Symmetry: D2
Subunit: 505 residues, 4 copies
């Protein structure tokens, strides 16, 4: 197979970075390295921040916050509007960096950048809303209201698999809420973050906004830990497959938004439109090479249609074009690294050991074409029961197929796992669709009808329940997590209730 060479990838990365305003000589170094899953090779070395630099960055962000929090929110929205314009102008440059570092095909990388633009649009509108309330008070000659105020520095921890959209959800909303941002991107995807920050620094300069509104800290795990532990960071937002962030921030009386992984199922009922269901399940299971927190990993199929659903999924998986994510023909690019491939192969072998049958895929493709990179065909595994390996999230394209008879059994099977991010049901039956969404239905934070588990849009709150961590980001009123509520009682009567009737004047 034809896979881009590491040198050609490095040239495309340097072009994209320079077009987005990154000063290559300023960010290059020998402390860390940028890399690409397309070949598995290092691209070039980078400077690093120390933990001491993290503290300096947090304090500079707090200084900016002291000015930004009294900057009128519609003015803060005008900065985010300028940034959305730069993102639109550089959409393909940023998408190229997403493909290079996350291994996403062109269409998915462009779609991820489009999420950034969409949430910028949403946040500009929010900058004239951020609604609190006015309400009656029981006290004569008083007034009562609830207001929302900027919180402080927001620490953003993102993962390799959505290296730009997750930060954009957090930064666009946080900035219009009067917060500032310190971003710790994945050690696997620093270049996407450098390009994003450079475009925002240009927006900031054009707007005359404070220079410290957003900063990227490049480093390994000690860098992230220092961010998480800062007493100057009242909110930490951590997305990706992290589990220690919650307790450690709680211990210093901080706030967290946590979205920590998913093990997402779809139910296929006897009345399901099978052409629709197969197409939707293929994208949900195989998109991003199965490396979304929202990836479809469990398919719960009614026994009357199980055999035909497996036959059609087997053929679909066998026809998936795997290859270089820069080629328009490709639908499946590589896994992120060798450790991900190892975990996938161990899960598939555990599954057959636990009684399962591998129906399609699972094999490494053209290993000699790019020996450092791991391209795999998505695996389809039929399972007699929801055993230990099925209940574990493996960050790889593995779709386990379980059968059911009663709808309540399908719901129990969906709910049995420790995670709780997203769920779907495919059905033409009005009653089954409502029962799946009812309070005793699927227990996840996202629950869909005739749609798979992935590909949310910006207008809804995004996040999940149980061990997914409970946070919400992006749409609806998820913005409230980035501000503090105040309840204000205002007395204009000139008097106060006298305790026991006694006047001490």
């Amino acid at each position: 197979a034809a896979i881009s060479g590491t040198d050609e990838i490095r040239a495309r990365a340097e072009q994209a970075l320079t077009r987005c305003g990154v000063d290559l000589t300023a960010v290059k170094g020998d402390a860390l390295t940028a890399r690409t899953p397309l070949t598995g090779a290092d691209l070039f070395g980078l400077r690093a921040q120390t933990p001491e630099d993290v503290d300096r960055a947090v304090e500079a962000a707090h200084t900016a916050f002291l000015t930004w929090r009294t900057t009128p929110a519609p003015v803060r929205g005008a900065l985010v509007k300028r940034f959305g314009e730069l993102l639109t102008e550089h959409k393909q440059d940023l998408a190229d960096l997403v493909t290079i570092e996350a291994g996403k095909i062109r269409s998915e990388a462009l779609g991820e950048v489009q999420e950034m633009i969409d949430i910028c649009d949403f946040a500009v509108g929010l900058s004239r809303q951020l609604y609190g309330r006015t309400m009656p008070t029981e006290r004569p000659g008083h007034r009562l209201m609830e207001t929302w105020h900027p919180l402080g520095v927001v620490g953003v921890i993102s993962a390799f698999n959505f290296p730009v959209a997750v930060w954009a959800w957090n930064a666009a909303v946080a900035l219009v809420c009067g917060d500032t941002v310190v971003w710790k991107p994945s050690e696997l995807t620093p270049l996407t973050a450098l390009a994003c920050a450079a475009l925002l620094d240009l927006a900031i300069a054009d707007a005359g906004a404070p220079k410290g509104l957003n900063q990227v800290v490049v480093g390994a795990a000690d860098v992230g830990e220092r961010l998480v532990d800062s007493p100057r960071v009242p909110l930490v937002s951590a997305t990706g497959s992290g589990r220690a962030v919650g307790p450690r921030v709680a211990a210093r009386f901080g706030r967290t938004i946590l979205e920590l992984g998913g093990n997402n199922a779809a139910v296929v009922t006897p009345s399901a439109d099978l052409d629709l269901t197969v197409n939707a399940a293929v994208f949900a299971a195989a998109g991003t090479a199965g490396q979304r927190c929202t990836t479809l990993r469990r398919l719960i199929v009614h026994e009357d249609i199980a055999d035909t659903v497996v036959e059609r999924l087997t053929a679909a998986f066998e026809r998936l074009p795997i290859g270089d994510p820069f080629q328009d023909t490709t639908l499946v690019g590589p896994l992120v690294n060798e450790a991900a491939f190892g975990r996938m192969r161990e899960a598939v072998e555990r599954a057959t050991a636990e009684g399962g049958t591998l129906c399609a895929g699972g094999e490494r493709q053209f290993p000699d074409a790019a020996p450092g990179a791991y391209y795999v065909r998505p695996a389809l595994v039929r399972m007699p029961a929801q055993t230990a390996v099925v209940r574990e999230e493996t960050f790889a394209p593995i779709l386990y197929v379980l059968t059911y008879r009663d709808l309540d059994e399908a719901i129990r099977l969906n709910n049995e796992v420790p995670q709780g991010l997203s769920a779907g049901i495919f059905t033409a039956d009005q009653s089954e669709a409502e029962r799946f969404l009812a309070p005793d239905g699927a227990d996840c934070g996202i629950a869909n009808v005739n749609i798979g588990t992935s590909g949310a849009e910006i207008g809804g709150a995004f996040g999940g329940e149980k061990e997914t961590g409970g946070g919400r980001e992006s749409g609806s009123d998820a913005w409230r997590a980035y501000m503090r509520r105040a309840t204000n009682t205002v007395n204009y009567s000139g008097r106060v209730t006298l305790a026991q009737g006694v006047d001490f004047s």
Copy 2:
């Protein structure tokens, strides 16, 4: 005179039996009920074990499986019936509040009335619990956000509001489809037994499931088992919990105390301010989370404000909380008195001047009880003792000149519950409430740090814990959000223009 222990004991037993408590089933020898009025033990109680906690959680979870599909308006009908029974027994319950918490009759009655008011509010919520419907970018699709019952709610309350805090949590949680396991303060079990018996009668009257609410009486080990239960998705603690519950991916509502200040500007109405400050600092013997502990006074009026406050503190009527003439009842126990004396001793060692109060009153009248005059201490700066709250009536007076420095002094402490500003100046009032003003969860103008009501969200920031209870949309913490997209178009349309065709 001070009420006798024998008379207090008989009133407590009468209140309990009238509220439906079976004294034979609850009496024992593992724990004792007590009263701050004399310091004496009332009688012994049965206690629960950690294994009893696990059994109570399983019964609450079984009831939750039925309650969560009971229509919310039907769940509200139960809470309306509970409010009626509370109204019926308002005086009986208030007597137990005075007996166990030591608060004066009028405040005990007000606390029971808070329970009734939150029942009425929750009945209205039972037809709302609003989510949203909104557009989607995909043709032939629909998008909405729905709210669902969460599960078993663990409630941990303190001695100082022994019935209203649980009522905030239980009324809202029950209409939200949740069930409740309640661990009251070991200092105030009798109030909780009475509350639970009245709710159990309402449950019987409604045909509702028996496990909707349960009280577990016990020591620290009982509370820890509740906090650690994997079947308790929400823990509400008022008065270690935070990271423990976060470690098992649970949710918390935390309101952990306050160190509340009011700013007095040069244009303040001094009669209003003095009355407001006395009642917020001395009320409940300084044992409210919202108690006024810091007064930040402009230097040009500081001397006259301290003289007026000194005169008022010297006149405060201290005595038996069953006497209507009493304004200040006793502190809860000897440790509370000891911590108060230690704070005042530290304050004077840190440069402060004791202007009034601090002395113990009529100790021979009840040697086991601690009636103390609230203390007023003028301080040269916001020193260590000022920044850390003592749960006692001590009012520290600090001075300022520029309003931004008064705001900084308000915000400098680790707590963040409530704040107030006394001023006739329109701009000063607004600056105090502005994003760069007071940083607390509650910030008021010309009313004190206890100015709050059922319809407002109640809670604070920083080390107060971040939770919100009672009013506005605090109910959302008792439910789980779901984002639902529905495709009725018969085709796969992917968001953001993604294309997965070959």
Copy 3:
């Protein structure tokens, strides 16, 4: 047998005195109370003049000046007390509803319970009535939106819901700081007198102002003076008003009737559909604004659906509404019967087939009363008589093949209150509720055209009038919005970068 007029009269007088009405003060010779059960007059009543209306408005406006500064939670306390008195007298009031409106006991009881439920909902609203706070583009400024009491509310109700419609309006209006002048149907004055006497007792118990609510009994000239008053900023009319009130810059809430349809798809559960359709078409003798009048059935099941409906209509129990076996009580008067017969005669002249019903029942048993079997008419198209509602139990059956044409048939009429679809198909259900589906204010799935409840906004589109009552945020129509910007910066800053310096 049918209840005797003498027994009905005595029950009415007993109900009225028990609800606090002074029979001596209200009896007269200008108007008469009546009963559809026998058609007979009960006794004579005093009537008000247009000058009495003007005096009632001035008294309501004087009370409004006090009520609008009474804190909303205190206003809610009055409505809670009213709900308690309604609960106390539920059976007495329900008896008057059956006597005057002719509706069966169970429905009369349900209507009084609606009043109690909206009282409970309004008590919750009294702590909400939410406006907004939001950012402003100007530094050192604050922006909010507040809601204020409007003034005197005129309420015009119909015979068919003689107590619940006024309760929707009065409970919400009172907690919103408004006062009420009520003009009930000339056919049902006794229910209104009872309601007002119970509310006046609650007003006395609360120490509230006496003019918060008043009833004016009279003919058309009394209603017109209310509609035309320049001191009545809101007129709510259920069952000329619109442009008249608009001409004096007043506000209206209009719910003027319905011509409601349900669509029956090939996958409909036929037992569910038949039960749902019978109760929505025949209930209240077809005299609900939400009554089912049009059934749009897929051609492949149309024959079997008409046979099942024919069998059910022939079995409907018609009789005295005080007998629990009765499902269909009498029509309100002779004119209602005449209009029904004329519609059925027109339908058959326009090509339709009378499948069942339409005949008058036991006329000799009560020659002044009109008990009729609901009529079922199969129609070849949606002709003139189908498009204009007759306030009578007539169910027209139309057929379709494509769902978009069933939707067009639903939407084609001038009315727009409610609609329903019976289907097992997920996509058909969603299409019916979609922006290009049914155009009505209420659109339901697998429940009939009367499917509504307190927590939902109630009302319709097109010639139904556009108003909304009861639930969600319908309360906003009873208040006035204010947008408030507050400058605390000490400088003039103009929006949009305007510069007026020289």
Copy 4:
């Protein structure tokens, strides 16, 4: 004085129109005429629509609506975003047309165009919101929700004095709500409307949106009446100083948004910052030559400071630079036409007849410099009582000064007039500011503290009470007036309540 010549104005107008994409040969004609208050002269003739053309336009807008209402709202928002970009690009061209037709100074014309851009920003955010509700139902195995649906064709009637912003408030919101628009602009300001429509038609072409989303009908009163009476127009929005629109639309069971004029007051208390109060009152009274519905026309001053407030306002009015609104030095341009000047002079003469004293202004400036145009100095009139002429709105810069003693008297004086649009209070006293805003305070739809009566921002709902007409447009949830509410009960239980327990199956 130096006033631009009619020929120079015509050249600037033709340049602005052509830059905004208007085809001059297509819109010119001999039925009506464009004009300018700067000289009072006609500029050039225009084609007209007939009433029959109005009906054709309404039906074409309804056809577009049938497609637009199922176009996803975020897609509808993308059109409004493109239109906001064209408005930003042509801001000064449009501002020139606003100056030419309404007579506004450069700063106010640019600010009016900026309102259009701001509401486009707001509406793009709204396109992912348009929030209804989900809520509990009392019925087991049912679900309940409230949804919002597009309404239909919206008829927009605007006035001369805000010839672009009012339509923008209505069109940006209506379009994202899935409605379509037929716009009838003032007969005095057709060119601004032609330019706005041409820019939006370009946005529509770029987006591939339906061609009939917005149309301008140019004509006299018979054209507007036909729009108002159309049974295909479920909402009519009429802004400007109209009073017959309400009843006529009500008679055909349509909906209206009405904002029909104002007679707006500000209260000046003894503690008022007088430098602030005078500066604010001068802009509120004199801006737009007193031709806003929000113009300050009544000043209610405490008797202890009345004399000094009048002295300072007298000097400020005497120093106002009146002249050509294209010159940067000008703060006051001309009144719209001779009829407006006549009404102003008649009001001032009535006022002195009713006991008042003319303290400053009121005289026509340099009549021979532009004999067809009416430039006047704003008039300041001290009045012994709130007499008939004070309670009447005269659409001219006349500021009546009334004195008071008790704050409740000032509030009664504010509330005594038939209008109810906006009110302000200038005070340093916390109690007086709250009392003015309380339920027994000012009765207007807008009530401000230390701000005048004009110059609202886009984020608030705009409109008034009493004879102002009750409508709200622009911000908050004013968008709900452009959609229809539906209450949906969904039964998934398979059963229904059986009446009297009887099962007919």
